[PDB]
Design a protein around this ligand. Structure first.
Ligand SMILES: COCCN1CCCC12CCN(c1c(Cl)cncc1-c1ccc3c(c1)CS(=O)(=O)N3C)CC2
Lengths: 270, 336
């Protein structure tokens, strides 16, 4: 297999930079419409949960992590602008897979297979959260796709800290030690919301630093050879270390029925 | 459905509709498998400028349509066509793309001269801007995949007078014509490369210089009559000239159907002499470096831009037309 290289080296003039790096306070101000129902805590748990759906499906459909990364940001970007009541996050979940797998030329995931991918991941990996069958059909995804497309102003090309990560390791020369761990830390950062606040090169250098701590690699000299904002890099590490203390304490399977029932419910038509 | 009502109606009230914003009905200028293109104008008296309205074929949004929008939303270069806006029609599930309007293109410019020749300063300047745009695309790892005269637009009277604008890049899956296709694709190659676009540029450049499509062919994976024509202009490749031709899926079909001796007095030098282009000239030598059989012996976008042909008098210009009146007619509308 292989991954989409299109627009590599042009983050700095991207739809990504210039419209989808969002100030943190703006993000938390829109969230206050949803924090009437869910707590600040229950809400970040909710992200982690759906992030894992966008991974399960993405695995079940044999997609590459670069598709998924993108699928997960599409999802995040929607609900960083609109309330949970607007469109079901269950419905949005694979509508983001579908679109991302097309946007990068991986494939038109068929109708029948997108929906059974849907039914199966929920039937097997998530019968603690969603008891009864996945209720939607392809017309619901197709409609949901048009809303999803509309919100993003068709800003469809996205980035992830993977590609800059690979560039950074290939200096140190620890592809037989570092890269595997770092790559999962970048995976785990998707449980949080750093990819809407931070340019990926920094999310890569953050994960690479945490990796260097875990395996006791001396990388001090190397990190001081970067004309980069190290405070902003230190901000991201805190978030990454906090992510793991949150993982430790969050019992997803015992807590997610109750958190989902507390989500604000859609208003029906007249 | 299970969506929020207040979310739907708010969005439905505020959503801009292409039929409300633009006057295009009766102004269809283009038809094809992709759908339709109109020369549209805005209904308000804000500006009297023209726009290209592409209505895409089919309901929903195809992978090709997704890919065109994704790339157009990021690409920004003077010689690549700009997406202004995208309209999403929730009623009928149709998608429209708004571009700046290009009055002319190479297909229509060439057809005018073949019905008549292109000034040489104009050719050079076209070639340079085509190379400038393709170099930009290749630097960003985006291949065109289907570069033809109908894609290379030229802006007419306006603020961007005589500027090349390339369209339809980065989403073509693998009567239709193969006259601008590279021989590796004709011999079965299963993927797009930067070399493929350079062959296309080589074919276009030849046709700018002569008005004839260099590999013009009869209309019908492996395409016999097309290759026959290629070898009649170029000659049949020596083993040394293209060593990995053996690795092509259709190499054994090539040996069955063809014989080297048939194209024994054929070569690009002899072709271009018949059309009064001197093989001592810098133009020919650049053309020969683009039109090379073996893709790995084909020069790059940037190398082509560094060629001494572009340092020879006259230099190319921002305005392809170079001041003087455009004799080319404007686009006529359609009906059916
Ligand atoms: C998948 O991709 C489909 C759209 N492709 C097909 C080739 C032309 C194109 C649609 C029109 N198009 C224009 C733009 Cl964006 C702006 N201004 C004018 C044109 C235009 C209009 C009509 C026209 C030409 C060019 C040459 S032609 O022979 O097709 N013809 C009669 C460029 C891309």
């Amino acid at each position: 297999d292989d991954d989409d290289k299109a627009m590599a080296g042009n983050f700095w003039q991207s739809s990504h930079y210039l419209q989808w790096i969002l100030d943190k306070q703006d993000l938390l101000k829109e969230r206050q419409k949803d924090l009437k129902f869910l707590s600040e805590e229950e809400y970040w748990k909710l992200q982690i949960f759906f992030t894992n759906v966008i991974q399960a499906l993405g695995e079940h459909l044999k997609l590459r992590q670069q598709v998924i990364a993108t699928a997960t940001v599409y999802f995040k970007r929607f609900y960083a602008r609109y309330s949970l009541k607007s469109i079901d996050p269950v419905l949005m979940a694979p509508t983001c897979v579908f679109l991302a797998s097309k946007v990068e030329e991986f494939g038109v995931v068929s109708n029948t297979r997108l929906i059974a991918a849907a039914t199966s991941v929920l039937k097997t990996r998530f019968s603690y959260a969603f008891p009864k069958e996945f209720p939607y059909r392809m017309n619901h995804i197709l409609e949901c796709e048009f809303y999803l497309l509309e919100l993003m102003d068709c800003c469809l090309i996205v980035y992830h800290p993977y590609r800059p990560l690979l560039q950074y390791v290939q200096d140190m020369g620890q592809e037989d030690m570092l890269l595997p761990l770092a790559w999962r830390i970048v995976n785990d950062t998707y449980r949080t919301d750093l990819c809407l606040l931070y340019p990926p090169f920094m999310i890569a250098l953050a994960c690479l630093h945490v990796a260097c701590v875990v395996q006791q690699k001396d990388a001090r000299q190397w990190f001081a050879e970067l004309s980069v904002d190290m405070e902003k890099i230190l901000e991201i590490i805190r978030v990454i270390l906090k992510l793991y203390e949150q993982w430790k304490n969050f019992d997803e399977r015992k807590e997610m029925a109750t958190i989902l029932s507390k989500m604000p419910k859609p208003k029906p038509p007249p | 459905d299970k969506m929020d009502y207040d979310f739907k109606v708010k969005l439905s009230s505020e959503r801009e509709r292409v039929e409300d914003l633009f006057e295009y009905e009766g102004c269809k200028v283009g038809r094809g498998t992709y759908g339709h293109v109109y020369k549209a104008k805005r209904k308000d008296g804000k500006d009297d400028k023209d726009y290209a309205l592409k209505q895409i074929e089919g309901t929903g949004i195809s992978m090709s349509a997704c890919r065109e929008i994704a790339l157009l939303r990021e690409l920004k270069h003077p010689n690549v066509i700009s997406l202004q806006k995208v309209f999403l029609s929730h009623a009928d599930r149709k998608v429209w793309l708004l571009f700046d309007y290009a009055e002319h293109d190479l297909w229509h410019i060439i057809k005018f001269h073949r019905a008549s020749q292109l000034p040489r300063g104009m050719v050079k300047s076209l070639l340079y801007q085509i190379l400038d745009g393709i170099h930009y695309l290749h630097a960003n790892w985006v291949l065109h995949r289907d570069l033809k005269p109908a894609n290379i637009l030229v802006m007419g009277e306006g603020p961007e007078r005589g500027r090349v604008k390339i369209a339809d890049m980065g989403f073509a899956r693998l009567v239709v014509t193969f006259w601008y296709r590279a021989p590796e694709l004709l011999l079965g190659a299963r993927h797009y490369t930067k070399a493929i676009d350079i062959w296309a540029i080589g074919c276009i450049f030849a046709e700018l210089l002569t008005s004839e499509p260099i590999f013009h062919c009869r209309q019908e994976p492996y395409h016999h009559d097309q290759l026959d024509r290629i070898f009649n202009v170029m000659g049949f490749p020596a083993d040394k000239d293209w060593e990995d031709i053996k690795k092509m899926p259709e190499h054994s079909t090539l040996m069955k159907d063809f014989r080297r001796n048939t194209y024994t007095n054929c070569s690009l030098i002899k072709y271009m002499e018949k059309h009064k282009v001197k093989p001592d000239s810098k133009a020919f030598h650049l053309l020969q470096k683009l039109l090379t059989m073996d893709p790995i012996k084909r020069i790059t976008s940037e190398q082509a831009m560094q060629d001494p042909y572009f340092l020879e008098d006259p230099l190319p210009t921002s305005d392809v037309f170079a001041g003087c009146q455009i004799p080319y007619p404007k686009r006529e509308f359609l009906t059916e």
